[PDB]
Design a protein around this ligand. Structure first.
Ligand code: CLA
Ligand code: CLA
Ligand code: CLA
Ligand code: CLA
Ligand code: CLA
Ligand code: CLA
Ligand code: CLA
Ligand code: CLA
Ligand code: KC1
Ligand SMILES: CC1=C(/C=C/C(C)=C/C=C/C(C)=C/C=C/C=C(C)/C=C/C=C(C)/C=C/C2=C(C)CCCC2(C)C)C(C)(C)CCC1
Lengths: 165, 250, 153, 168, 160
């Protein structure tokens, strides 16, 4: 593999199965593969929060949005987005814009691990041999596998909602 | 080998249970088990009951013996012993298996954060994620108080703008005149007053402690801090006025 | 080698290489398998009937209400054929041709060839591809029959 | 693990599974012959049981006492055994077959070992030596599945009152 | 870059807006891959309108469940709401693979318009540039023809 070894033992059904049934990674360089993972984790981390946000909003808990609209917004998260006051949406975009600015320009993640937006690499070990720790690779699997599931899950929610209610 | 650990009857203790005891017990304690250690009872009985010794016991004595020996389930297995022998090694090596408090407890995050800092005996150099992580370090360094290349008046102006813009809100809303037709000029005045009071406090600090980390070379000590505080007052005025202007216009 | 047959040679009046033939071979075997599944698959809603039944999504106790060779739909089993389409993709993305080192070898999960009866190479590999070619024409000819010449039988 | 028995090996994404998480093999190694014999005989009967519940729904035996409706899988047992009936015809037949197994392995089943277990000697389809290994695992994997399947069939069918192939 | 397959003859290096004063060497191939992909789609798109106009609509049923004789679906804009979303999904899926096939990632053989069609592979008779330049030039014509055709079908109302 050579370059895909930098993201090795971190995907597939079982943790050490480089899936890629399209050749999207072969012939690509090490930095490109790392950047591809940075896109994957960022999508998945947002997808995990997106699914959680979808469920806490599709059950009837839209306080900020019921207290701002002075009426219980519809449970359907897609329809509740329209009812949500335009001031709320613009502030929501701005807050994420500040976070995206903050991570990129002032506090950039490293170039070898462009997904360390919190930056554990300066205090983490990741290469020791203890059992009651050094399971960081396993928790990387749980983040990726859960996030990948959340990505297809949230799309299913949006596609079904926008079509078959 | 050790005398009393040979040819011990299975009735006194089973073979697998005895091996588990010997594994759990440290090697140096086999010869003379201490006291109150299952191996101590094994020695004190296997030296009385065996092939060449008393081969029978009263039913009650055997019943009490069977309740002094381990029941094959209260002993740590090899993997548990490895868990302990490696957890203690991590803890003594200055590395902590990272854990995060939860609902009356903590979840192990499966990460080895090196705990002791560069000065291992220093108490405030124990590196944590929230202060010594890459994001935390770059966020603290990029604050107006710490940002490289900023003139002292620029730091003061930025901090003052933030403070003045924020301080208007708590007064213009839920204030004594929160329901009056103006209800915001009062908040503007109160926010400017708070900015002035904290600026006066900063001037007291700079004329008493006199920090010299912002002074350029060959200047009156504390001049950089005083300039920062004066421009914080100016920035607080500006931010308060800007927040008031936004509230009135919009 | 492999699918070279007996009644004809390389039958290439148009690939004719190594790497390009390998990809074409993967297409050939793949199309062969589906036709054989489809050909025997089409004869079954015929004699033995529209065998299905049991509690299905919007098709509870559906006796395979998708009639005719095309299957039609109308929320009858053919909508459930999309589940066949989806799960067909799962096998097409897990046991696929990108890690399929030979032409169309899936590592023989069933191990039918581990002396259960099929054999490696020789006639069996040639018999699979030749049978696939016959079924592909048969399935296409069966498609013409349903369209403008009645039904299958 | 468990002698050379073929329950493990050729068992999924991993080559070998070796699922004995109580130690009933290591604790009782003298019974690995008995356990295989029981495991296989359970699978074969369960497979005939599941394929059973379905076929009476279409064809019925010419015994002319079984040739009656309403004999589903919740009443066929208590109905056929009479004041004797068809159930004794089946039980006597199972006695004839089971007696043959005694002759091959002795009365006390002393000849029962970890390689002749569940091997009555009926060899028509199998060929070669590695296929026998492959087929033996294919036997069990089908057999173990049907043992859980008929278990779900019997419980779900009689609890939810299904009594037919969907068993729902 | 001034010597690739795009410079035909009637116009030279036609970059009036200066995308090439800063166009990196890989950016050319990336934009060339965009141009080749755009042109090939346009040729297929154009055929897809002029051919159902002269040749009648498909003899068939399009959707075996929702009575689409291909005649209730007009040739042009508005057919997007007439063709089923699944027939739309299935063409989306088919086009989805055609790029999730052998990769067109930067530097890959799929990144310069090469995919393995080889319908017209002349035996290198100084014609590899001819077929390449013709495909690029026709794609440029097809894109312009389509946009006019799209405006023809829209502004007039239907078809042409
Ligand atoms: C934002 C999407 C995204 C991105 C950028 C990545 C990126 C990556 N994945 Mg990944 N993955 C994702 C989503 C994503 N993933 C989802 C949702 C799943 C669940 C099925 C997976 C499951 C998965 C496995 C099982 C494995 C990877 C692996 C990898 C790495 C190898 C590169 C690769 O596979 O192609 C990178 C490029 C892409 C993924 C392109 C995105 C997809 C294109 C645009 C077409 C898809 C469009 C789609 C058909 C239509 C959208 C709707 C759809 C939901 C129906 C790379 C870091 C491998 C790895 O690192 O293991 C060591 C591996 O084994 N992924
Ligand atoms: C992908 C991430 C994501 C995005 C884009 C949104 C976007 C939105 N959310 Mg939301 N939400 C999310 C995750 C997300 N959420 C999660 C993880 C939770 C669980 C705590 C919620 C819980 C939540 C509630 C309870 C409400 C919204 C609402 C809204 C809408 C108005 C903005 C707002 O008040 O947010 C506010 C979001 C929070 C207070 C959640 C903070 C938790 C963060 C993500 C932790 C980091 C907006 C469409 C409001 C609405 O009217 O919905 C239509 C509303 O009342 N969200
Ligand atoms: C008791 C409240 C109070 C206090 C202690 C201060 C204190 C100060 N003000 Mg001040 N100020 C206040 C209320 C107050 N202000 C109010 C209510 C207004 C609105 C009219 C202003 C408007 C104001 C201006 C316009 C200026 C100050 C300035 C100053 C500084 C000289 C000093 C820090 C000056 C300053 O910051 O220069 C460094 C300055 O130019 N103040
Ligand atoms: C961006 C600069 C800016 C702008 C556009 C305005 C705009 C306005 N101010 Mg204002 N103001 C500013 C800075 C600014 N101010 C600053 C820095 C101060 C502190 C000295 C004030 C103090 C101030 C007072 C005390 C009052 C205004 C008032 C007004 C309004 C007349 C108008 C909306 C008046 C108003 O309409 O209040 C309701 C008013 O009474 N402003
Ligand atoms: C009563 C049914 C029965 C019996 C007698 C056995 C017997 C056996 N199985 Mg087995 N098995 C069964 C059902 C059964 N299985 C089912 C339903 C499954 C599917 C989950 C499996 C899956 C399975 C695997 C994956 C493996 C075995 C193996 C074994 C052998 C060694 C383990 C052992 O001592 O089990 C004896 C266990 C019992 C007698 C417990 C009975 C139930 C209690 C009372 C509850 C032994 C011959 C192993 C083997 O063959 O080694 C090579 C092996 O790898 N089995
Ligand atoms: C109830 C049904 C049934 C039937 C029809 C038979 C029939 C038979 N058994 Mg049998 N047997 C049965 C139940 C049954 N057994 C039970 C419940 C057991 C105990 C598990 C045995 C244990 C048994 C042994 C140990 C032997 C037989 C043998 C025989 C055969 C001797 C013929 C004979 O004496 O006929 C009148 C015959 C085929 C003999 C045989 O053929 O085996 C070599 C023999 O030695 N049986
Ligand atoms: C997707 C469209 C597209 C793209 C990506 C390219 C890309 C390219 N062309 Mg190209 N071309 C196109 C369409 C396109 N072309 C069309 C339609 C024509 C016919 C007029 C041409 C004619 C043409 C010639 C004659 C030559 C090129 C060349 C080139 C290459 C270098 C020039 C460059 O950087 O262009 C970059 C192109 C773009 C960035 C496209 C931007 C288009 C802007 C945004 C809009 C233009 C107006 C538009 C028609 C408005 C439509 C109205 C609508 C809103 C209603 C480059 C690979 C040259 C070459 O190969 O050099 C070696 C060369 O000699 N092209
Ligand atoms: C060579 C290509 C071509 C051809 C043959 C036509 C042909 C025609 N155009 Mg046309 N057109 C084209 C490209 C073309 N268009 C392009 C690229 C644009 C966008 C710049 C337009 C924009 C356009 C408008 C706005 C109008 C036409 C109209 C017409 C018709 C007079 C005629 C059928 C007229 C028409 O029939 O209405 C749509 C008309 O008013 N054209
Ligand atoms: C929730 C209930 C449950 C079901 C229903 C189930 C089902 C099957 N498991 Mg399974 N399993 C767990 C639970 C369940 N497993 C758990 C908690 C663990 C963690 C200890 C675990 C681990 C393994 C491993 C390591 C293997 C394995 C196997 C199979 C197998 C055989 C298929 C085939 O070979 O025919 C089938 C049908 C083998 C394998 O082949 O998996 C495909 C094998 O190697 N399993
Ligand atoms: C809640 C939240 C949070 C927090 C946030 C914050 C903290 C915010 C802040 C904010 C702020 C705090 C802002 C501020 C701003 C300010 C401004 C914007 C200002 C401006 C000013 C100006 C502009 C001025 C000017 C002037 C001067 C300088 C002087 C003269 C006069 C004048 C006026 C000209 C977190 C993240 C934790 C999480 C969750 C969410």
């Amino acid at each position: 593999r050579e370059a895909p070894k930098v993201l090795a033992g971190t995907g597939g059904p079982l943790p050490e199965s480089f899936w890629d049934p399209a050749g999207f990674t072969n012939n690509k360089t090490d930095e490109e593969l790392l950047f591809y993972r940075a896109a994957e984790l960022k999508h998945g981390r947002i997808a995990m929060a997106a699914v959680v946000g979808w469920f806490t909003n599709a059950s009837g808990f839209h306080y900020l949005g019921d207290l701002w609209l002075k009426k219980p917004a519809s449970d359907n998260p897609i329809e509740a987005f329209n009812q949500l006051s335009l001031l709320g949406v613009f502030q929501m975009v701005f807050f994420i814009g500040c976070l995206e600015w903050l991570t990129t320009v002032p506090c950039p993640p490293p170039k070898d691990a462009p997904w360390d937006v919190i930056g554990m690499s300066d205090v983490l070990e990741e290469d020791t041999d203890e059992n009651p720790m050094a399971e960081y690779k396993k928790i990387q699997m749980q983040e990726l596998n859960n996030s990948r599931l959340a990505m297809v899950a949230i799309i299913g929610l949006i596609v079904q909602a926008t079509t078959t209610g | 080998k050790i005398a009393y650990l040979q040819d011990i009857p299975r009735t006194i203790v089973e073979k697998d249970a005895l091996e588990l005891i010997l594994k759990n017990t440290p090697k140096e304690q086999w010869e003379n088990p201490p006291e109150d250690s299952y191996l101590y009872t094994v020695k004190a009985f296997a030296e009385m009951y065996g092939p060449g010794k008393a081969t029978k016991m009263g039913w009650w004595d055997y019943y009490r013996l069977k309740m002094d020996m381990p029941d094959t389930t209260r002993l740590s297995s090899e993997r548990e012993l490895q868990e302990i022998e490696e957890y203690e090694k991590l803890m003594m090596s200055g590395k902590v298996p990272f854990a995060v408090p939860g609902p009356s407890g903590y979840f192990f995050t499966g990460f080895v954060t090196q705990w002791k800092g560069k000065e291992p005996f220093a108490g405030d150099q124990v590196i944590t994620l929230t202060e010594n992580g890459l994001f935390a370090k770059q966020f603290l360094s990029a604050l107006a108080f710490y940002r490289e290349g900023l003139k002292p008046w620029q730091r003061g102006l930025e901090i003052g703008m933030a403070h003045g813009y924020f301080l208007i809100g708590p007064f213009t809303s839920l204030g004594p005149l929160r329901n009056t037709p103006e209800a915001a000029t009062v908040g503007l005045l109160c926010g400017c007053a708070i900015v002035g009071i904290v600026s006066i406090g900063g001037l007291i600090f700079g004329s008493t402690i006199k920090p010299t980390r912002f002074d350029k070379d060959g200047d009156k000590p504390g001049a950089g801090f005083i300039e920062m505080i004066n421009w914080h007052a100016v920035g607080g005025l500006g931010g308060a006025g800007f927040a008031h202007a936004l509230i009135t216009v919009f | 080698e492999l699918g070279v047959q007996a009644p004809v040679g390389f039958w290439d009046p148009v690939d004719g290489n190594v790497a390009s033939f390998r990809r074409r071979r993967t297409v050939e075997l793949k199309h062969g398998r589906i036709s054989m599944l489809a050909a025997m698959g089409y004869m079954t809603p015929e004699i033995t009937g529209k065998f299905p039944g049991y509690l299905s999504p919007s098709t509870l106790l559906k006796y395979d209400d998708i009639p005719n060779g095309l299957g039609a739909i109308s929320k009858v089993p053919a909508l459930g054929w999309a589940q066949i389409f989806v799960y067909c993709g799962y096998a097409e993305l897990s046991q696929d041709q990108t890690p399929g080192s030979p032409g169309a070898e899936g590592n023989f999960g069933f191990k039918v060839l581990t002396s259960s009866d099929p054999d490696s190479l020789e006639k069996k590999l040639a018999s699979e591809i030749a049978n696939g070619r016959l079924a592909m024409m048969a399935f296409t000819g069966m498609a013409t029959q349903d369209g403008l010449t009645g039904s299958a039988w | 693990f468990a002698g050379g028995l073929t329950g493990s090996d050729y068992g999924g994404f991993g080559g070998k599974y070796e699922w004995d998480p109580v130690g009933f093999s290591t604790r009782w190694p003298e019974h690995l012959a008995w356990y295989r014999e029981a495991e296989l005989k359970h699978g074969r009967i369960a497979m005939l049981a599941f394929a059973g519940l379905l076929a009476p729904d279409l064809f019925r035996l010419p015994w002319a006492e079984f040739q009656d409706s309403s004999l589903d899988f919740a009443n066929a047992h208590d109905k056929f055994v009479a004041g004797f009936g068809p159930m004794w015809w089946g039980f006597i037949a199972c006695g004839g077959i089971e007696y043959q197994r005694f002759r091959k392995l002795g009365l006390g089943m002393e000849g029962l070992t970890l390689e002749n277990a569940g091997n009555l000697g009926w060899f028509d389809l199998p060929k070669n030596s590695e296929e026998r290994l492959f087929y033996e695992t294919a036997e069990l994997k089908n057999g173990r599945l049907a043992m859980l399947a008929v278990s779900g069939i019997f419980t779900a069918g009689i609890f939810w009152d299904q009594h037919h192939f969907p068993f729902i």
